[PDB]
Amino acid sequence: AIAHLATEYVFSDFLLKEPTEPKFKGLRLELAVDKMVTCIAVGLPLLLISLAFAQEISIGTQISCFSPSSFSWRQAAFVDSYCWAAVLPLWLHKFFPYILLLFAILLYLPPLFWRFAAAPHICSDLKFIMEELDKVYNRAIKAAKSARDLDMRDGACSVWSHPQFEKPGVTENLGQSLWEVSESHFKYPIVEQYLKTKKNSNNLIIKYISCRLLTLIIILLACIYLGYYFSLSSLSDEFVCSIKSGILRNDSTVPDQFQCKLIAVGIFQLLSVINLVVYVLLAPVVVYTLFVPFRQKTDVLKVYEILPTFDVLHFKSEGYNDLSLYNLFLEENISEVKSYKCLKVLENIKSSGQGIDPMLLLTNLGMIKMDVVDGKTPMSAEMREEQGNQTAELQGMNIDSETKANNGEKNARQRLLDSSC
Amino acid sequence: AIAHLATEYVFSDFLLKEPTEPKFKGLRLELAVDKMVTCIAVGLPLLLISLAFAQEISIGTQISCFSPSSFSWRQAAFVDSYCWAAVLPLWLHKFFPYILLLFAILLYLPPLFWRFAAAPHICSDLKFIMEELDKVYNRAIKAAKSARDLDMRDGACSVWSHPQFEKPGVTENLGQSLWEVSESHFKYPIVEQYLKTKKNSNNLIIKYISCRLLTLIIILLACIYLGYYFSLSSLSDEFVCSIKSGILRNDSTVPDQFQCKLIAVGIFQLLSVINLVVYVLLAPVVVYTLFVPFRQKTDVLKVYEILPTFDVLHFKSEGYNDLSLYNLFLEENISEVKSYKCLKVLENIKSSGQGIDPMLLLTNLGMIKMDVVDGKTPMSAEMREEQGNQTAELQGMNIDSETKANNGEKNARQRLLDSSC
Amino acid sequence: AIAHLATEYVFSDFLLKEPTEPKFKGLRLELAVDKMVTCIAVGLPLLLISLAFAQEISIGTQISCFSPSSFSWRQAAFVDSYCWAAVLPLWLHKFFPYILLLFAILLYLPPLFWRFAAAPHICSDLKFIMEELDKVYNRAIKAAKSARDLDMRDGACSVWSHPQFEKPGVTENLGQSLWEVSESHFKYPIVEQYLKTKKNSNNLIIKYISCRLLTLIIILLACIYLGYYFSLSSLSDEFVCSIKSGILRNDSTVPDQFQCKLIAVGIFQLLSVINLVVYVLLAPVVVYTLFVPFRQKTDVLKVYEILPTFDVLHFKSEGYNDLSLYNLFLEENISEVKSYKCLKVLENIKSSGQGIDPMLLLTNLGMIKMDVVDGKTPMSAEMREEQGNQTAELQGMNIDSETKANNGEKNARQRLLDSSC
Amino acid sequence: AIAHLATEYVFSDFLLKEPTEPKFKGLRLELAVDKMVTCIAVGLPLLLISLAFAQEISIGTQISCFSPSSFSWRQAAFVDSYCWAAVLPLWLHKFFPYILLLFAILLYLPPLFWRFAAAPHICSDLKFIMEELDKVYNRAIKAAKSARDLDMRDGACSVWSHPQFEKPGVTENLGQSLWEVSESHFKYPIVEQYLKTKKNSNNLIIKYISCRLLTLIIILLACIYLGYYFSLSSLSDEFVCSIKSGILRNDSTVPDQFQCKLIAVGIFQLLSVINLVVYVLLAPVVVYTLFVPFRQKTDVLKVYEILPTFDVLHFKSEGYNDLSLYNLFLEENISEVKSYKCLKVLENIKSSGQGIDPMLLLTNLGMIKMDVVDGKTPMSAEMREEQGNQTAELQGMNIDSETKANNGEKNARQRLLDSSC
């Protein structure tokens, strides 16, 4: 049978889990709900019909007819073969396994079109925006670190701890008393305009909704077909058959009518119920997530809201604007970014000491001015909060490979079981 | 059966998704529409006939005949075998599965010829042009960066921020007060003549249209055959058979005529409809994209239109000129180029401040002349817009591997299901 | 059946597409036409007979005979078995599938002998000649670049742009006012004598024509056999059979003669036509390309015709001289050489300015003598045309691996489909 | 059947084509003729019998007997089974497929013994001798290059071109006026004694001839068996059978004698002819190459005959001396050595200028003494013939891997085709 072989052909497509050697390429390229819907909606029909093909062979088993005892073995076989072909439309039982394949094939194209067209475009855009996110994070603390030697009040910490300027940090260059201050006028980063660039020119969102709506209508078309077939299969499966057509029209030995019955509709009726109940439960899941302002209402960029110099999240939520789609992909792809975890702890220092009036930008100089005028001892405070927030993401920014979609193995289903007797 | 094994043999050819380790080798080598047309036009006939071969075995099932009860089991079997061979031309039903294979094989050669001949040639040409695209981008800003130390009006920014000249950028060499200006007379780049080089000598475009037109005519040849077969199968499938030829010509026990019927035309008739409706819908898609001035009317090189020094897009659109073909391949292969994303944000600064009169070439010196005469503070403005547009593409320009066309795995279809009873 | 398993065994041999990690190892080792001829001439017979073996089982299906009704089931089976063995020569129908295998096996040896013997020899020769081609290209411009500091007339460009001599190019050594001139007497390169070395000693060309002519004669031998078989199968397929030999010679119950018929010649006759029409169309393709002075009349080395110092293409075209064969391999293997693309643009500057009198050897000094006597500004013109033609091929000249002929995968055909009933 | 599964088991052994990552490991380890003989002599019997096993099943098909009509279905089946076992020796037809397997297995051991024992020993010996071949080549020119600064007559070329001594060659050390001359007394290289070391102690040649002669005698043993079987199968295949042995000896209902016939000898007779004609054609090929002084009479070391200082090929050709065997392996393994191609052009300069009196050792000083006394200009002649013959083989002399014998893939034959009906 052909039923359970596209099963493994699809099992190697939604199980990517790419072993991303580079710094960050764990790009899902589709939402989690999309994978769950596609696998269930397509795979489940293949599993059910695979059971059916295990017994719907030996066409003489599909239909049987009653014949007079005077007939021979071959004459009785002719009647069964004749009525199977020379057949309320009862031919729907004949093509029932064929139809369920057509639904599965038509339910697999919309995922394929997205993979061929909209997948490479969304891969580079997310990679570029997350590439430059850590650059802003690194420069912000480095500018604060470069401003360290300007606000010394404790001891003689203008310049000290000098066997090497950055002996734990870096073995190059040396430092001395500061004479420069950071005055910046270019406050807007690259990401600020990139958000506005994607705020118009709706060309990738249309490829998303169009693929989704094509899948939705196919589900309804399959749902009504199962209901129509279920009603038809619940009426009867027996009919009278006459083979007196041709030279046998004037035969006085062949009986006028024969009794025949299809004995495969019992299994088919059960299969239609399972598909029907699953589809009517899958439809609300698809419908509930059609709306753009669905779950994940909370903002994702609020971590960098006040970090370098500027403000973030000055925009609302809307519909057809090519936005709120990259935000969805960012949430499922923010798992591997070292800036996010580092910023995930700053907001939690809002307890006593850094409470109702937090700034969290130059907090290093907050507790180096009220101490003793005599005695520097700066080596502990001046580094324990400097390389603990920069060295983590300063490793491996050059690797770029492993973009193939799940080469994997043939470990999935293969060829059914029974081959004997 | 042989039906559903070229299915996996072709499934490993249009699913490349090469894991390109090098800087940029994600070369599709064919358009997205070509892959969709080839897979549907070739794969779908194989899927349909694979269902058919699951039951068209045991030749006694293919045809049946009515015989007198006085015949034995072997004598009745002789009649069925005789009329199956000794057969309106009714032999078209016998060779119907054979013909559909011939269409699939003939529909696979034009893709194969393009792969063997025109694939390696188009691989190097696109790689070379995109290799030199980033070189022009890097030198343009570097020349602007090298011209930084000439237009200082703020403070004493002629030379400053000197623990190291390019401590974030590069640890080599040092800088001082500028005395050289960039005077260029060789304005034409290499890409300018390469476009004109491909503007004539039409030798790769002919290999594209010739392969496409061969596929188109085969589709029409298959379309008319299905219509002719559908009309024939709708007339009748029964005939009279006589075996009295030879020593049996003067036999007084064998009846003169027998009634026979082919019982496989019912399934075959349904299969012809599915192929017919799909092909008549696939034909407009192929025809609509035959014209060279199809979709993607907008220019792709307009991003570099005024970037280094010159102007781009001084040419119109035409037909047989070996042009407008590399442009199509560039659009599907511009996904992985760091110059494109960097230039994709310059045009969006057209708001207030950089509006009706934009230049976007030396905008760094626009806002360093009206500030205070006293106080340099140049470290912020002089670097935050320099390594943010150059370091991105300065990583990994040496790797070159992974040009194999989808080694992949055997995860596709394999050997059907049923083997018992 | 054995028909459709050498199909995958050969599918892994002509689909190399080696993922050449090294600088250039994309060596085809055979012409494109050779692959197309071998795959079609060998594969197509296997595909056709694979259909035939799907039904030519159960030897009682191969032949059938008419027996008296008084015979039992076993007695009737004896007659069919007897006449199948105890058989115009009608045994050609028995061995028809066997013969077509013999043609396929004999049509596969000539490719195998070339692979074992002439493949490694041609691999190193093409690799060596293309290795030294870029060396001549690099030294030519470098000599021109080394001669830059001798012909200065503009400004004071004798020596300038000196924070580092080759800061974009190379971080080593320094330059000053030139005092040496390039006087060369050894004008002949290594490639000049290598062409003459291969101009005699015809030992690899004989291994090419001998393999080709063996394939050609086998095609004609198969072509006549199909025509002879087609005529034989069009006469009759019925004969009389007598089993009265031995102790049954004096048996009064066994009828003297029986009527038998072979019912597999109908499918075999169709298969012979398909092979015949394909072979008579493949023969002109092979014949048309037998001549050495076939397509690719234009020279390939005309790009380097005047580049370093000398002239190229001082030779005509001839036959048995071991030449004009490496030229064919060079054309299909000139795809990956950085010297070719670089030289492909020089000839197109033949427009106004560099028209009827082009030299294109030291054109850098053409436009540095008529400018202003005061003001050097040499940094733009002296480098923008120097590293743009040398750095491209100065990367990765050490890698050498991936010479295996298509390890690939088992993604091709495997084991047919039907296994039940 | 077991016939066509050692076919793929052997297809992965003679198709090595190792992807040798190291500098040179493309070691064939066996001659080309040995691979062709082994594959044809062993593979071809497996292909032929694989056709035979597609129909020699259902033992009732192997033999058939005529029985009285009064017998039942089971009684008639007993007669066929009895005479098949209770059987001119006619049992040779029963064991014919078994025997052809025994020939194939016995024809595969001699290749296996050579692989296990004599393969690793011959791998290191050829690797070592070719490792030291390039060392002699490199030192010869380097000594000539080191002697360059001693024979200057043109200009003031005693020392010149000194921004760096070997700026294109190597960035280390510097050169000046020469004061040392190359006086050598140790003229014998390591390879000179290694040739004499292998000139005696015949221990690897015996493992070669012994394996070859075992294969030769097996071919003759198979050849006579086919001729004996062909004569036997051409006499008759029918015999009388009596089952009256035991309690049936005094049975008055069982007929005394039965007529039986083997119907598989027709296919077997054809198979014997194909094996016979192939073997009698393969025997002269093996015999013609038994002689040690066969083809490849010309010397291979004549390229280095006068290169460094000494003379080569002072020895004749003989038989059992453990020599003339490494020479055969050298010819098939001289494909990948950079010294060979470099020396392949020196002998072709024998035209005018370097004709009847060639030396080709210090030809660099031939054309630097008759030029002008004033003006050095040495930079062109002193390097263009120095790094063009040394840098080629100065890359990658450390890699050592990929010695496995064709890991490959399962792309070969697998499991036959037909599984239904």
Numbering used by the authors:
A (entry chain D), B (entry chain E), C (entry chain F), D (entry chain G): 2 to 88, 101 to 434
Give the article text:
To further elucidate the function of PANX1, we propose the full-length human Pannexin1 (hPANX1) model through cryo-electron microscopy (cryo-EM) and molecular dynamics (MD) simulation studies, establishing hPANX1 as a homo-heptamer and revealing that both the N-termini and C-termini protrude deeply into the channel pore funnel. However, despite the confirmed presence of the full-length hPANX1 protein in the cryo sample, the electron densities accounting for the intracellular link (160–194) between TM2 and TM3 and the C-termini were subjected to local density falloff without local scaling and sharpening. In the resultant full-length hPANX1-MD model, the permeation pathway of the hPANX1 channel consists of an intracellular channel entrance, a pore funnel, and an extracellular cavity. The heptameric C-termini protrude deeply into the pore funnel and occupy the innermost layer. Thus, our current hPANX1 model is in a closed state.
Pannexin1 (PANX1) is a large-pore ATP efflux channel with a broad distribution, which allows the exchange of molecules and ions smaller than 1 kDa between the cytoplasm and extracellular space. Pannexin is a family of large-pore forming channels that play pivotal roles in cell-to-cell communication. The regulation of the PANX1 channel is complicated and remains unclear, but it is commonly accepted that PANX1 is regulated by extracellular potassium, intracellular calcium, ATP, mechanical stimuli, voltage, low oxygen stress, S-nitrosylation, and caspase cleavage.
